[PDB]
Amino acid sequence: GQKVHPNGIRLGIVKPWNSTWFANTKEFADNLDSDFKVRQYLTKELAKASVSRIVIERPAKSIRVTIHTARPGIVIGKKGEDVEKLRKVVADIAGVPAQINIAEVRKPELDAKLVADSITSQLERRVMFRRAMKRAVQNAMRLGAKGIKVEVSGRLGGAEIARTEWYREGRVPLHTLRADIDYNTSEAHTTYGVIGVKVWIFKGEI
Amino acid sequence: RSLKKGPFIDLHLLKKVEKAVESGDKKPLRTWSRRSTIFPNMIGLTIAVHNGRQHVPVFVTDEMVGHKLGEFAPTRTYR
Amino acid sequence: ARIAGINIPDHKHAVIALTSIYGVGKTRSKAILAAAGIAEDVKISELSEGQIDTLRDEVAKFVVEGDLRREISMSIKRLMDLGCYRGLRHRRGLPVRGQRTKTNARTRKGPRKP
Amino acid sequence: MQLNITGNNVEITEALREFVTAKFAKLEQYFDRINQVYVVLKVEKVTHTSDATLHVDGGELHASAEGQDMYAAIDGLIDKLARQLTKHKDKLKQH
Amino acid sequence: NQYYGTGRRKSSAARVFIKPGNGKIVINQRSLEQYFGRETARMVVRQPLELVDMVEKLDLYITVKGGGISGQAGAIRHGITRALMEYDESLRSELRKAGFVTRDARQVERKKVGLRKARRRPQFSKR
Amino acid sequence: MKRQKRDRLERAHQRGYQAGIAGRSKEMCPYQTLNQRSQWLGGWREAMADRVVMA
Amino acid sequence: AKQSMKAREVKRVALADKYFAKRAELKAIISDVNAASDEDRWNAVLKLQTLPRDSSPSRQRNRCRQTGRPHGFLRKFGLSRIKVREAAMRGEIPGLKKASW
Amino acid sequence: RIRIRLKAFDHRLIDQATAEIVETAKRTGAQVRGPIPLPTRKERFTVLISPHVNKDARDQYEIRTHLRLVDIVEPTEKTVDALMRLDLAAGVDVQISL
Amino acid sequence: PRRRVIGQRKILPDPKFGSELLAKFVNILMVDGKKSTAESIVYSALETLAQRSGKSELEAFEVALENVRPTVEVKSRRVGGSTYQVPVEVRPVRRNALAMRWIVEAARKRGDKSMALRLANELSDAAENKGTAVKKREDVHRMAEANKAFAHYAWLSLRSA
RNA sequence: AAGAACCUUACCUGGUCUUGACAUCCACGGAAGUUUUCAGAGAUGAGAAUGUGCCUUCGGGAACCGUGAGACAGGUGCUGC
RNA sequence: CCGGCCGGGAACUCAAAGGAGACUGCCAGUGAUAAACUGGAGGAAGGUGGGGAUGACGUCAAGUCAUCAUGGCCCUUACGACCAGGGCUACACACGUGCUACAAUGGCGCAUACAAAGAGAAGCGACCUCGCGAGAGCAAGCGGACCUCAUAAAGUGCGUCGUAGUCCGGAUUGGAGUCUGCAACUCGACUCCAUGAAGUCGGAAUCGCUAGUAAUCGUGGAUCAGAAUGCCACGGUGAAUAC
Structure with a gap:
């Protein structure tokens, strides 16, 4: 309990942020709150999907959750239905619509x-x-x-x-x-x- | 030394006085509103201000008018 | 050098020299000279008696020594006779306005006996 | 030398404060001029421990003693403090 | 013609325009004496014009801004020496020796956390 | 925060002088380089005389 | 931190948005200096006691929204000082990083 | 006459979205007054770093708000609609003024 | 310190007179971080030192200073049980600063109305070999010259200049 | 504790509620909501009017509200040894 | 209308993106021809330039079960839930950390010069009227290098006070108000008039500080309806000393 967080000490230098949205000070807090709830929700729901990291961006009153996982087949499921199954409940608890993606690590x-x-x-x-x-x-x-x-x-x-x-x-x-x-x-x-x-x-x- | 315009009373003290003055000088009025002032049509009453565990009665005298009801009912007891 | 009952300093300027009256300070003391047509930096030896008598009835307007002392005694004795919270603190010698009493409280207390 | 007593989970009774104070006064008189003493009593479910910090001209000196009944711990702490004081005293005599 | 030197010192920046003229010094559309020339350390604006000559040789139009009295004063002292750039290292080689060209980069330190005013610590005392 | 004082040359002197006065008749705690051992021993022999002049 | 307290906060948000900013006219319009300073004004400062006490915006505590912690809040972030370090070091608050000057 | 002010958190992304608009307003029309930089807002947040006592252990933070102006002098109707349907690089927020 | 013959910086000379000793003297009584009113005290005191002395001001201050600058200074040392003071010679940089500190303290005593009058009278008696700082000077010389019998080992003032 | 008049608030005295203030599962009614009165310190209890679409499977599919059975919920309660 | 005020200019301050620059790179001496050290030049900076962030393996079974999470245990018509009032602010005393002083390097009155950093939408709130004043009414502007908070103060020039518990100190208490908020009694802040305590530089013991530092002087922010003498920031003036 004495070391700096080695992901947080290098956030401009090496690592990217997990959120790439600009919000002015009137909507920054809620714009971070729903941003939290889709991470808690997707982390709880996709626990078998071997999710690496989810990146949330907000272009023009919309949202994009890029889901970094190891097994994208369990993520998209049969035919790609489970992507839309996630996307309806993402759009319900965020600003509708949603463009979720998958970026698997090989x-x-x-x-x-x-x-x-x-x-x-x-x-x-x-x-x-x-x-x-x-x-x-x-x-x-x-x-x-x-x-x-x-x-x-x-x-x-x-x-x-x-x-x-x-x-x-x-x-x-x-x-x-x-x-x-x-x-x-x-x-x-x-x-x-x-x-x-x-x-x-x-x-x-x- | 506050509240520039109008004294403060609750409706459950104002209507409770205006009920119980025309209805004769009666039983002591249990009151929890310590924060309310003392109007001149409250003179002559035994009101029991709640101090936290009692309802201590104080006879409203003519000099007590500009004050508040909690001012004449101490809460902490020393010695 | 005799207004309101005492007023005996000299070699002092006037607006400071009036402030030995119990009831006047540096604002009302300027109100007396500005209301009685006297410059503020003159000395009590430099006033003539035809000005000093015009300052005696001038300071006879605002309340001074004896009336103010028996008046403040009427206020404190009135509160102690009601037995409110404030007068209840006046009957015991603790801070009235709601100061800290756990630690300091020591002007109203006095010296420390134990 | 004023002794300050405090207790974590140990309710400091008046008979407890009388004894500790007497023992500290006796030690202070015997070894060196002492300015102030802080006493801490801790109970951790088994171990009755005591800490003391003496502020003396040379500086701070501290001791700690675990016991069985609190009284034993206090006695150990006081003896330890006396030993420490002998060391500090002629450590600053050293003619 | 007209020659320029910037100069700055301790959160305070000057703009010095020197010209071959009289011996007058104008600071922010004021004179030196009615700007700070009887105030604290008025010598440190005429001081780099002492190791060189200035008497009725060059007039100065100076606009300093930011900082305080001696911050603006050292800012002008640096700005004049920078404005002696057409009067070359015959003068600036003999103007290295007495200072006058170091920026003197000592800024005020930031207040560190836990410390009260960047060195002062809140007195762990035994009495 | 600046640089070392009298760069072991006449600090080697006063180490040999203090070590000379406080007994240590070894003359066997010096440095090993020549320019510092020479005046550790120099301060040692300048300290023997200052031991004879006092107790 | 005590779901009772957490639901009490959102109850005060609900009544605080329900009553006032719609019946703030009882003080911001009526309780003013005008040619209406009769017992309509005394009827107003008489009237605000009839309203629910938990409708004023000054019974809010403005708690953290992941823990409900009452102390150590940031109005910019909506999180307490523990959770904003937890999400800041994770990389959640965008653009936020450690400062040194 | 169009006053395009845009702010973001990363300088190496807002200087990318600025070059994504100078090539627009110079691709059609002309007379743009440069990528003008503005002063950076530096919101600083000092928080306690332990969940309890140790007041003196803190953690200092800042966010950066970078701003850039564009100032299209004469608008063309290809330019005012060229501003439309091109608002990418999420992280950059833009405002047009008339 | 243990290390560091430190990179030393110089000072600005005095504006009104060509002296850095005088600027050091302003920095001595420059209490509370405020140079300008200390300069007004020094100038206001050297003016009445000129009128109350006749001669010039820089030579007035320097002649008034050389009657309080010391030559030997005690250093307290302990060996074993004793703790005797041993005379070291003062180095001529420390010398005049140690004089001016005594002038300024003896002017913060002595209390007259104004600080320029106190320091002016104290420099006057420093010319007269009469005041307080000459008594402190003679105290230092009496106890170093009284404890003169100690010239020893290595903890003070190596070989020569 | 980066800010105790109420709130906060965890403590005390009194006044109340019990599948509960917060979440899910079952059943039955009702759109939710909105204006006002009485009593009471208020919580609460009693009312008085107003209000009615999303799909036709239609006692609904939703959202929301009340009562009922528990599985439970809840705990800033103890143990940082 | 001499106000960057207006056409205008892109030099300069500045903004802030990209680069350059400082590496014992060069020179002289010392050293085992070594690492290095000492001194010099050039340079804005010279020896890790100033400061920050960065806390090795571990210790203290240190702190936190009241941020959270969690094993176990305990209550589950009460240790849970709701409301009013109180208390957290009590006060024979003891200790710690600070603010203001004890004054003439100053107090007061008039005039006047010079900052950086930051905050703002149920928010910051010009100007103008009313009020001694805290403030009130109207009300522009500004999600801001523009508008507002917002007059920086110490300083400086003039005048007075002449060493006294004083024209120091500003505690306490009385009266009258303002603002916030349902609501200032317990218990808010501020203003005005009056009141005018201890204190004349602090025993034993003790702390910080090596340079833009110490010491003083003001400004801003967060938390926040209101409530900083604390905390976190920023600039002004600016030492002594290190043998």
């Missing part, structure tokens, strides 16, 4: 949201956290990440004392601002409590 072993969701689900179905936490590092390093650091925290096997472990391999330079680090954090609600998982994935320098 290398889901390098996305920090999907690694943390992987370790999260495997801890929910009670696997050994050295096997999961170590297998994520293996699967990134034999596929092309320049660095990775996974850390789990909590009870982790019903212990009465919480502890953390972390299995870095390679370079994760958190202070270099040009260094591209995808950091993300997920939470596993096991029957002994909450186990927090956070993963850094370093890819390149520019």
